[PDB]
Amino acid sequence: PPRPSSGELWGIHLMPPRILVECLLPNGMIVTLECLREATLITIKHELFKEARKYPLHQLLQDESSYIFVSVTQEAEREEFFDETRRLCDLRLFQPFLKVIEPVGNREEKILNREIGFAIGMPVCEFDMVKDPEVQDFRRNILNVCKEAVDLRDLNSPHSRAMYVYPPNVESSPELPKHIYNKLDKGQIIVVIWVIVSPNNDKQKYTLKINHDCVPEQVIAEAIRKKTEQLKLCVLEYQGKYILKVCGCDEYFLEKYPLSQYKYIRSCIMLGRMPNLMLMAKESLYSQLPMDCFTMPSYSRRITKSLWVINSALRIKILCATYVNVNIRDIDKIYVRTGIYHGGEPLCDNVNTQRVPCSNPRWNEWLNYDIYIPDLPRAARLCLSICSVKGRKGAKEEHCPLAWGNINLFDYTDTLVSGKMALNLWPVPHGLEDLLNPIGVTGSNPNKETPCLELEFDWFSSVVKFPDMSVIEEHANWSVRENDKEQLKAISTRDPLSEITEQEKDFLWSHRHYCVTIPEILPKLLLSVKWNSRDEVAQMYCLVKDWPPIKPEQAMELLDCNYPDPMVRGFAVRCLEKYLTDDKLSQYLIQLVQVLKYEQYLDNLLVRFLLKKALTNQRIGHFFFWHLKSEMHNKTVSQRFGLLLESYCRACGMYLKHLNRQVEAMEKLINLTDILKQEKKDETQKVQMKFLVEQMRRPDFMDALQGFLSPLNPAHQLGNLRLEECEIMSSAKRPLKLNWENPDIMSELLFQNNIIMFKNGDDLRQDMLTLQIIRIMENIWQNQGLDLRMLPYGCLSIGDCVGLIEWVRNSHTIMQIQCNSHTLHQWLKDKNKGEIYDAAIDLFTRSCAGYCVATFILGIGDRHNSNIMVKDDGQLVHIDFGHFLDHKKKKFGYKRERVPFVLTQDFLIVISKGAQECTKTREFERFQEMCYKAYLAIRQHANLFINLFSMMLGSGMPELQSFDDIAYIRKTLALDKTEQEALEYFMKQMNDAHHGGWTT
Amino acid sequence: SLQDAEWYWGDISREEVNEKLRDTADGTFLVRDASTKDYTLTLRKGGNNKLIKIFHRDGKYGFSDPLTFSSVVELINHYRNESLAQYNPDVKLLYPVSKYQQDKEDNIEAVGKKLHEYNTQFQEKSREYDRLYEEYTRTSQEIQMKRTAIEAFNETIKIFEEQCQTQERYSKEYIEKFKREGNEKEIQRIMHNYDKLKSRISEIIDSRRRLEEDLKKQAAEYREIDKRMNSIKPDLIQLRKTRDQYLMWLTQKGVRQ
């Protein structure tokens, strides 16, 4: 299992300088050795075999060289230590002992499995022990993806390997937005090609004025053309001898994309910055690239009636439950509420058992469902729970769920479920009030110290299986105005959560064949199908088979908790395979990882699609690793995520070693923050920091916490940890501000110091999602011609209430600035003196409109002088987004869409360039216009935002548990209203908050 | 009239309707003002809430053309007896959600006073629940840790007991080989080391037995927190719904825009 604590031993956070270790010799003898906490095992073995002479039977011991150590780790694993260069404090030992053994078995394989299990934070050997055939089949069958990937990564071995490790950081459209174009002088950019020229280190600047459409090798060509018509062949050859890299980071321009299409260039054009590139040889890069190999694992090398034939209604028998944790002097009876679901929709009216006493949880009752067994669709599930009924006050009885669980009516091999079944039930997810949990994971609770429920599925004298696609295809053939053209277009454009009337369902279903013209209607039409009917589903399969592909932003909707059909989800995956860019995949990765939870089975086209891309692109692979790693503690997903991460780590190549470096740096930081939270909580900041540095100054600490890749950006290298600029903040959960040197050669042109906040104690998943949505909002604006510049700094959740936050350099909270209502305008006046004053004001106004629209729509936690900050730049930055949507509705039942960010007098003064009647200026008119645009832009892309939120319902986020939480976004964007009505709505909202000023 | 009509809920939300229709029998219905501005009939059937639009044209009402009915009431009442079985196959409009069945506390000051008391009791219980939840998750996490450490002790003990077997295996020959060679000192040395090993095994066995005991005690307190949690939860929902009703009445009785 995963390690209980962060300590160097069980119940010890850090080992004393010297420690006694029990050494179990192979001659049966026990040797107590005094070991220095940071002594490597090579030394320990050496000093132990020296001392072993003093003890009896030393004659039986072979050379020290013939052995290695084995011990019980914190994960309760018997780990063999082949990397003898490892120190004693880094072993993760449960107790201070070491057993001396001669190494047996496959050294190569054993070593990899240690490295995989460390990246996962769980011993791989635990998956070998899993009896479940699905679990085993999944491990074996997924290896084809692993093979497919490593094989593709070696065609054009020097280049293809580099396209994996350093992929192109490109936008999805080469076509420049018109507002970006006008920044270019006569449709061309000024780039600065820097070159380190051997024999001496020094620089040199080849300032180039080139077309923005220029492929990196055309930029490489014009770089030569300037530094030196007779030598046009000399450039036509030597252009494949040098590559382009971004100054200050490991970002590379390897593919033939137009220069402006690269994100570093595209940004530089917009922010009026000079793109500083570094020219380096292909040979000096392709040499650094190692030969990563995929080996097949130990486990890979080792060893009927149709559903449509069954003429009966579905029935399930509830035998008994083990126990429930309830007071009898409070509840009256206990019962099993059950339901047959297709996603989140009951296929039939829910069936309860009879009411029995908690002391006697035995029913032995057959539950009858109003569903004909042939009519059961592929994704049919059984959702059930044990509730507590008590009607002590009034006619109304109070039902409260005690434990839940869900089973797939069909196994991973289309087999209908039969015979007895034991199901360990899960705790009720906090905040869930509903008696059933259909968004819940399928399968038994792995912890067997939980209520078990005994179920009995019917037997049909044979193995029942779901029909083949040919049989279902056959059945579909057996089963078979201009005002109507307008109504169909109308439905297709409505948001994913708006009402469909039974009349609109019958309309859509009756016009199923015309739909194919407007493919964007597939989800509404899919909601018009009767899934409790084999006749309509059969016809639906043939239509989706030959359904035109839809945009990925639309396809993702078909991957949420509302569309469980494998043929539907299969269509969805194929749209993404064909049309989803690596940019958009990186953009919506949080959601794509998240929806793997809704999938019925471990092996599916989504898991395969994502894993393939993770092994094809190292940027995608890096966050795919972390997103899954950060949820390994959640027993509802640990096995699925463990198995997927296992297959990822076998095939990620060299990147496993880099990932391990980040993981080990993180665990030290988790240990350090854990000491200060418990053992030294009642301590002073001056004494807390003295402890902090003393521990960080240690050899083992420096070795682990220096020279690794930032987990916030794998292109960011974290060199030497500058201990002097490391600080424990005096705030909420006391985060760690950590400073690293940028080891990059031309680091001066980007940043020489990388600062990252390390939070241990608070859940950041929700903050992480708000910044992703904010990133997605800026793009919608940037591509639509709005320069509403926000600063969405990186936030990554790296575990159970543990994460990283990108530090925002040169920023100060409004409160800090107020150290008068003119203080703010004066601060920016002094910080941005002269000509540059106009650019700072334009930046503050643009960031204001962005954060105003963004906060209002999402319903972000109320703003204040600590929540808001300003950069020397003029740039406004919002920090802390622990709440969103109607988070205040449960505490205070006030039905109110609020304005979290109300521009105060200070704010309007800044925008108005110090004017008196602030709401009357031409500067404020320009501000309102920006907001009205921004708002309509997001309201245009509403479906995208609704789907992104919809894809997160199973995440466990406090403020996102039901579709009715997503209804908040539907109010702020006034989707039921018209474009003119919603804008008019937004205006009244801004007016009531600001107390007039918002003129039409 | 469709104002005096109990099933008619005016300006109610779909989210509100879902609560009003959650875990109800088929035939359960209620009419409301459409999610625009034209009315919507919501009906429970097969565990779902089916939204059926009420079309109006030139003072005539119905679900589909021809519009036969004269009023929304005449429309409801017809299907309250005739049944929807004929119009698209399926139940009737049997169990109405009455806007009159649930409790009008005389004066604005009276409601204001009671709401204040409810809202206060609510924040009290909310805090008590969140606190019990903090301990519920902390105990659950701590038990899980303990369970992994018993697994680690078990494996520790397995290694040490194998170590005894190794001593037993090897030493048996050498003790015989030393008794003959008259070397009693070395025999005493083999014995001292074995004694040393088993005394450690006894410490490791008691370290686990003490931990297994703390685990019995913590599994016990987990069971109580759960028992307590399952009792607060239903009261806290009711108490929150009562509060939310007094907040709505206050709004309904007062000056509205």
Ligand SMILES: C[C@@H](CN(C)C)S(=O)(=O)c1ccc(-c2cnc(N)c(C(=O)Nc3ccccc3)n2)cc1
């Ligand atoms: C000038 C500073 C005072 N010195 C003189 C000591 S100050 O106080 O004006 C200041 C404080 C914080 C930040 C900062 C920078 N980057 C960030 N990502 C964050 C951030 O997200 N924090 C956060 C906090 C709570 C919850 C979630 C996130 N906070 C910047 C300035």
